[PDB]
Amino acid sequence: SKVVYVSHDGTRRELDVADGVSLMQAAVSNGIYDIVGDCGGSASCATCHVYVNEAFTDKVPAANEREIGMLECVTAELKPNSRLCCQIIMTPELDGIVVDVPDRQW
Numbered sequence: 394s395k396v397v398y399v400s401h402d403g404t405r406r407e408l409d410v411a412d413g414v415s416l417m418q419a420a421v422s423n424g425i426y427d428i429v430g431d432c433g434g435s436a437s438c439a440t441c442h443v444y445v446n447e448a449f450t451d452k453v454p455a456a457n458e459r460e461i462g463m464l465e466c467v468t469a470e471l472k473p474n475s476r477l478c479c480q481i482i483m484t485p486e487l488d489g490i491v492v493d494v495p496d497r498q499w
């Protein structure tokens with residue numbers, strides 16, 4: 394799956410995340426999330442606060458309401474399509490997913 398991460402300054406990182414691998418997982422293989430994780434990626438922290446293109450959010454496993462309550466626990470501007478990068482699984486069919494990461498991931 395083609396995985397691009399859009400930072401703030403406009404710089405991007407294109408990876409290859411296989412099926413079942415979460416963006417937070419491959420970000421550790423290319424050295425991108427190098428910031429440790431509180432919920433260890435178990436959907437329970439705002440460490441992976443990022444904005445996923447509203448084109449893959451309704452296609453990738455949109456977690457039930459358990460996250461919708463955590464999404465209301467970040468320090469950055471939430472978005473209708475906000476998402477906790479760890480609770481996401483990439484797939485070759487969803488190749489081209491664009492992720493937007495803010496300066497305040499908290």
Ligand code: FES
Pocket residue numbers: 417430431432433434435436437438439440441442477478479480
């Ligand atoms: S890394 Fe903890 S919520 Fe995603």
